Design a protein around this ligand. Sequence first.
Ligand SMILES: C=C(C)[C@H]1CN[C@H](C(=O)O)[C@H]1CC(=O)O
Length: 258
Amino acid sequence: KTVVVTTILESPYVMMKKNHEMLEGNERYEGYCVDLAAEIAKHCGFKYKLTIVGDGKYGARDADTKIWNGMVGELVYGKADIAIAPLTITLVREEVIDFSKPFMSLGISIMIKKGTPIESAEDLSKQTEIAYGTLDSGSTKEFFRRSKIAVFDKMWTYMRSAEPSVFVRTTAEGVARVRKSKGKYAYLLESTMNEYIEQRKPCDTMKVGGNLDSKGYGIATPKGSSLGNAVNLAVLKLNEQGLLDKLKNKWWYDKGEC
Ligand SMILES: C=C(C)[C@H]1CN[C@H](C(=O)O)[C@H]1CC(=O)O
């Protein structure tokens, strides 16, 4: 059967082509993960249909409801066959679905407006005049919650209680708030999105310091899937031959504006 790929709109992973209105099917999307899906399909020998995740979410389990949302939920409930998106490999997700080896390696990072006296996470926690927060939900937020490393455990302590919520709802909202915040707000996000935005006009932001942790993005399939082993060997083949790094330069640095 034809494989149903769940993915999500987020630059430069997946975006609607300009002429999307006059296009159909897989031809109406473009991006790192669209390019990646085509490669994975060619290597594993399958025809597929790219679909944008119903709820625009990635994957989390509602507390008492115990229902999984997002792309992971589409995999878990059988609404999708494979998830090709910037979906962070985490324990809670790997408990319910399968992840391939990373196709991309990243880590949480700090994004500041050009000119901020913050050069590190320590610099951040040790003060308070400079605001700093994460996405309202996602893997970065859970990193600070499930945390007990001196600075990170202390950083979380500070965030939850912050006055204006310091938490944002989207990536574009954290960037918009760092730029409209005129120096006061620092956004904590994944290095990948950070590297991408550091290459967009007005070229007024920048990644600072090293990453807080070492993670990866993986292609997910429902636990015990026939496709699992194939996609996993596909990712390793793509990495080894260097195509993964070419695809990143393409979507991140070839068209760099700064
Ligand atoms: C863009 C979003 C909401 C995603 C992308 N990977 C992370 C994930 O899969 O949880 C989330 C970002 C973050 O939490 O910093």
